Every structure is written in C-alpha cells, then in structure tokens.
Amino acid sequence: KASILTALMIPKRFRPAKDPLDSPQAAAQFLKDNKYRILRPRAIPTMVELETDAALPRLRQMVEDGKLKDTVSVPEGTTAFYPKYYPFHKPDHDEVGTFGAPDITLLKQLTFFLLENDFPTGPETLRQVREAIATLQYGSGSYSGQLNRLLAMKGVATGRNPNKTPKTVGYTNEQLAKLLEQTLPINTPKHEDPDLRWAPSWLINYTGDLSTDKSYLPHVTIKSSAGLPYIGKTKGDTTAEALVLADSFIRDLGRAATSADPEAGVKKTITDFWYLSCGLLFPKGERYTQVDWDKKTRNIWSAPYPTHLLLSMVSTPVMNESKLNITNTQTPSLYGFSPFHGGMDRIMTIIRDSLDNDEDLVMIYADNIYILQDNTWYSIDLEKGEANCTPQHMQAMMYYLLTRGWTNEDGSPRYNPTWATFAMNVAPSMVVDSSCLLMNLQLKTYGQGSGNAFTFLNNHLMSTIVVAEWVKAGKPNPMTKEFMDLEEKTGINFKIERELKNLRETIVEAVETAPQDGYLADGSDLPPIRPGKAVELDLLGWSAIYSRQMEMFVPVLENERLIASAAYPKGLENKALARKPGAEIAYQIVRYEAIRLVGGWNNPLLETAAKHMSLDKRKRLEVKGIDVTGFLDDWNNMSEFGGDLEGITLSEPLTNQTLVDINTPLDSFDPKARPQTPRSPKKTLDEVTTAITSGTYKDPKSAVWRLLDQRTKLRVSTLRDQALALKPASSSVDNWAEATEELAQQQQLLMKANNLLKSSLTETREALEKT
Ligand SMILES: [Cl-]
Ligand SMILES: [K+]
Ligand SMILES: [Mg+2]
C-alpha cells in the first residue's frame, strides 16, 4: 500500500562540481596567482579562398577528376584575430548522461553469476568492480583539472628539480647518438623512400591510375583535430590546406636561409607562421578519480596539422623500418613490442636467463624504465615525462635521426640544407617550450607538448639519459638515495611505480600454481576455478600468466586496468557509426569480447558474466535475422583494445582456440640468435657509458655529421654559409667527401668567433613569441 501521490508519480552517478575556473578571467587570475607564464596573445589572419590548382599545382589532375575540392582556405586575410578554443568537458555539473556511464548492467550480471558460482576470487572481483564504479569516472575532466595539470607540468620543469639540457648534464649530440644506437637502434628509411628534399605536396603521385597512385607522405588520423589555424575542423576537412601551409613554411624557410639577410628572413617566416608552434589544449578522455576530478585532467597538446606533417616526414620513414626491440634484437628498447604472438614468453625467457646468470637487466619504452636487479623487478616512470623535455633534447633526437637514419651507404646525407634547417634549427622550438591555447589564453608550454609526433622519441631519449647515468653510478638499487640523486644529476624527475620482490620465487609460483582446468590449461572453453599467480610486471600494462597447455607465459591486462575498463567502458564515440542499425549491439558484443580477450578470460566471474552478455546479444541477432558481421570483422576501430589485437575477427564467439591463436609465435625463440644493433653491433650500453665517462665520442668523425652538430651552435645569420658547407655532400658532387672535410674544417675555425654562437632554438622561440 502506497499513497495516491506516489501512485500518480548501486553507487549513485558522479556529478562534477561547478567549475569556478570556467571563464578566461578566473583562469588567467588563477595562473597569474600561481606564477604560470601567459604569453602576450598573437593574432591569425582571416581565411581567403585560393584556387587549389594554383596553390597545389602537383594536384591539378585531382581537381580536374573532381576528386579534390577546387578551392583552399588559407590565412591571408587583411584582418587578424585572436584564436579561441573551448574544449568539451563531460560529464559536467549540468549534464550527467550516457557519456561516461558506468556499466551497471555488467555489475548486476557479476552479482547474479557470483550467487550461482563458487569462484574463490569472485567476491574480490565484484568488490573491485563496485569500488571502481563508486570511485572512478570516465570522461574529459574540467577546466580546473586542465589548469591544475599545467601547474604540475610547470613544477616538474622548473620547481624542485629544474630541467637540464643534455649539454648541462655533460653529453654532446654525438655521445647521445652513441647511447641511442644501443637504446633506440634504427635502420635508415627504404632506399625507394624519398629523401628530405621536397615540399610535402611533391610526395603525392596522382594521375587517376589506381595501380600507380601513391602518397609517400605519413598516414594520418582523418577524424583527429586539424589544430591551428583550423579550430573546429578535422584533418579530413583540411588536408589540402595543411599541404599548402607545410609547403609554404618549408619553401619560405629555405629561401630565407640562403638570402642576403638569413636572420631577418628566418625570423619573419617563423613570426608569420607562429600558430604552427601553438597546440590546442585538448582534455584527454580517461578514467579519472572522482575526488581528484578538478585537480588533474591530462592534456593532449593538439599540434597544428602542417607541423605534424613536417615532423612526421622526418620520424616515420625511419621508425617504420626500426621495429627493433629486446625480443628480436640485443637492445634494452621495447619499441614496437607486442606481448601477443609469443612476445610475453620471449620477455619471460630473457628475465629467467638474467636471473639464472645473476645479471642485471634494463628495458626502456619512452618514459618507462624497467630494471631487474637484486632478484627484484622495478617499474620506473619519468614524473610527467613530457615536462622534463628541453628543446635541446629534441634537437639531439633530430641529430640522431639525421645522422643514423637520413644517411646513404657512402655517408652522404639524405637531406638538403632546407630540411637540415627545419629539422635542426626550427622544429625543436615549435613543439618544446612553445605554447598552447585554452579559451582565448595563449599559455606557455613547459617541456614538450604531449601528443606531438616526437613525444615517444623525446621521452625515450630522456629515459636513455637516466639509464646511462644509472650505469655510470655503478647501477645503484632503485630504492636507494644514490638512485634518487640521478634526478638532480639529469634534471629529469622520476619515481618508482612498482617494486616486485622475490622475482625468481614469484616466477616459480606462477608456473606451479598454473591451473589444470580451463582456458590454456586443459584447453576447455571455461575460465579456471582458481586462476594461477600472475607475474605483475606492468610491462606496458601487461602481467604474465603461465599456460600449461602451451607451456609458455601469456599476457593478461594488469588487473587494475582490466577492472577500470570493465567498470567504465569507452562508448562508441563515432556519431556516424552510432546512427547505423545494429552498431550499438555490435559495439556491446565487441566491448564484452575484447574485455575477455585482454585478460577477462582468466577472471572466472568476469569471464562468466561477459560471455553470457555477448552470447545473449548474438542469440538475439540470430533470432531477429540481423547481420552485424561487418562491424564484428572491423571491430578494432570500435574498441580501446583494437590496436592490441590486429588480424583477429569477433564474428565468431571467443573460445580456447582464439586464446591459442593470439598467443601463437611465428618462430621459436633463442635469445642468443637475436641480431646485434645495426650500429656499433658488438657494443653494449655499458661499454658506451664507459667510453663516454672517459671522454670519447665528443665529436663525430664524419664531416657531414660535424656540420650537423655545428648547426646546433651557430646563429641563424650563418645559415647561408652553412648551406654552402653542406651543398657538395647534399648534391653528391664528384669528390664531395674531401670538399665536405675542407668546408667543415673552415666552419670549425670560423666558430672561434663567439658573436656567431647562439642557439637557433632560442632565436626561433623569440620570433614565435614576437608581438
Ligand atoms: Cl599538460
Ligand atoms: K625536471
Ligand atoms: Mg610505466
């Protein structure tokens, strides 16, 4: 019985608090009170329509065939205005909806299945999912979170442990290159890949013939933001515009560098294209802690499309040929590592051999360092990695790419003076210690902009410096003051995230506790009643579990990430796909299959509930006669785990065979059969560090490489003379090597004049900030 009034008419949803910093005045005052640098704002000319065939003559046929729009919009208007960027912060105080909704259906299913099954780890799984729903929130944070994050970046760059250039730490570019030959081994781009000699639009071959139509340019994310000067547009809406701007920037830089006044011309070009150095401060979608919603929102520094394209032309042809890591090469690098197809078992073999031989082991992946020492596994992270970067760290990376990558077999460069100018003299100041845009505020960026094309490379170089210093200090244990003292020595902040003690014993336990029943145990299509012990390496988010069926370690997503993803799944996030009938149900099948694939299969309660949910949805589709095989075959794009499992289809339900297939190696592994690094093959990181400590490799031997190192020290007014010094090697003229040797000797002599010594990175920053 209820009242007529009533008759007439699980954790609660998180509602973010009202944000007092959601206005430019309140945000600017907050930054000023915290001594965070706000730049004097710069303006961008309004858009003007130009004919595509006049602006992009190489693409005339594409316009004629109606495959490319006949006009391009370029910032050449008579009036200039200050740009404004307003991100979407969801959920927020006024809107708590489907976006960022926890998976309450899964929570209810986990509860129903726990009541029917005696899984000993079931109560803890349910408690963890419930706790993640109650304490976390998937979404894009707030203005307060973004602003507090900027303060933390400034603190890392300038606070307790101010940043240090590699030169201040004590490394020349050549010494860093010698370390990188070991920690980031690279191959040269393919011989058929064009050298760095052209405007980007010249790398597009279009005639209409599908057999020959090709682009030699990097690939792009069509749906990603165009960045400045096209706020609110995607890369798909602005490709022709990005080509026009990237061609103009490189052309104007090249012409200015060899002009009668290189300083005036180069500074003018940099100031005219200032917006190419300013990133949109995009709030990253993550599973944030509810209590810290307004204290921390991670940011993506959204690079202008022309800058992204020019930087990617330098890095991508090298990196595409350099998937060299500890599982296939004798290097500490984890670049291109996948734990699938036997990857995790290769890591476990290396770890086990190190333990048996009483050897220390180090692995590097961008801002992640893994150390095995004293029967202990250490997972180390640079503290807010990107904030530690100086423009000189990126310049050292450019030096490494141009000397080890962009070089012909005879030692001649695979670039001309224009591209050496962009790469060495200008590019590092465009994305490091430059600026970002939030609302109408042009803010200083402390360190490198997170998300720029060189994010991984610059972070990897900073970790390389920390590791080289650890080797130099006699490998002090990560838990000691001697290890923590490397922060001040390098100017790079870091912290120990995990300490996995009694490693040898933990590995023995993982093998011995491997279940006899279920998936990868006796090979049935059921989770084990009692999962075995995981080796919680947190190796790029992965733990290792022993399989009795396959007699190898296989990866499982770290428990905490698995639980967070089960509690707050990412939505479809594609409005076009969402409007197609069956896309939502296909995405739900994908969500439950992918959570099982990455490690849910080994969690009996999670596996039971997720299997029921995907099977129930497949049965409904079968009864209804609705075919979603198309969406299920092309599942990767609709899953946060899509990049982890390429080449598999979800059209058939997950079975033990799926788990076997994703873990099957193409080849057997012998760690001793791994090739040595392409450069200095016989040398190890330890031998390189010893050589450096003794004062070796200060200067490269190659005259071409010496010109590139001198390029980092000479002021922009010397660019015309530097172009003349590089011209014989760049043109591969008869006797170029002797000519280069002579020109490098003459330039070294002229450098005795201190008035000619100024970093072009400082000159670039000054021109970018000019008002
Ligand atoms: Cl940031
Ligand atoms: K620092
Ligand atoms: Mg890490």
Author numbering: 11 to 19, 31 to 792
The publication says:
Members of the family Birnaviridae possess bi-segmented double-stranded RNA (dsRNA) genomes and form virions with non-enveloped single-shelled icosahedral capsids. From sequence analysis it was proposed that the RdRPs of Birnaviridae possess a non-canonical active site where the polymerase sequence motifs are re-ordered C-A-B, motif C containing ADN in place of the conserved GDD catalytic residues. An additional unusual feature of birnavirus RdRPs is their ability to self-guanylylate: auto-catalyzing the covalent addition of a GMP moiety to a serine residue of the polymerase in a template-independent manner to form VP1pG. We have cloned, expressed and solved the structure of the RdRP VP1 from IPNV in both its apo form and bound to a catalytic metal (magnesium).
We have expressed and purified the IPNV RNA-dependent RNA polymerase VP1 and determined its structure to 2.2 Å resolution. To characterize binding of catalytic metals at the active site of the enzyme, crystals of ΔC55 VP1 were soaked in reservoir solution supplemented with 50 mM MgCl2 and 10 µM GTP and lacking citrate (which chelated metals, frustrating soaking experiments). A single Mg2+ ion was observed bound at the active site, coordinated by four solvent molecules and the side chain oxygen atoms of N389 and D402 in an octahedral geometry. The coordination geometry of the bound K+ ion does not change upon addition of Mg2+, suggesting that Mg2+ does not replace K+ in this position. As in the structure of IBDV VP1 soaked with Mg2+ and GTP, no significant structural rearrangements were observed between the structures of apo and Mg-bound ΔC55 VP1 and no electron density for a bound GTP molecule was observed. However, when soaked with an excess of Mg2+ ions we observe only one Mg2+ ion at the active site, coordinated by the side chains of N389 and D402. We performed additional experiments, soaking ΔC55 IPNV VP1 crystals with up to 200 mM Mg2+ and 40 mM Mn2+, but these failed to reveal any additional bound Mg2+ (data not shown). In the structure of reovirus RdRP solved in the absence of substrate nucleotides a single Mn2+ ion is observed in the active site in a position corresponding to that we observe for the single Mg2+ of IPNV VP1, being coordinated by the side chains of D735, D585 and E780 (equivalent to VP1 residues N389, D402 and half-way between D559 and S400, respectively). Upon formation of an initiation complex two Mn2+ ions bind the reovirus RdRP active site. It is therefore likely that in the presence of template and nucleotide substrates a second metal ion will bind at the active site of IPNV VP1 and the resulting initiation complex will contain two metal ions coordinated by D388, D402 and the nucleotide triphosphate moiety at the tip of the catalytic motif C β hairpin.
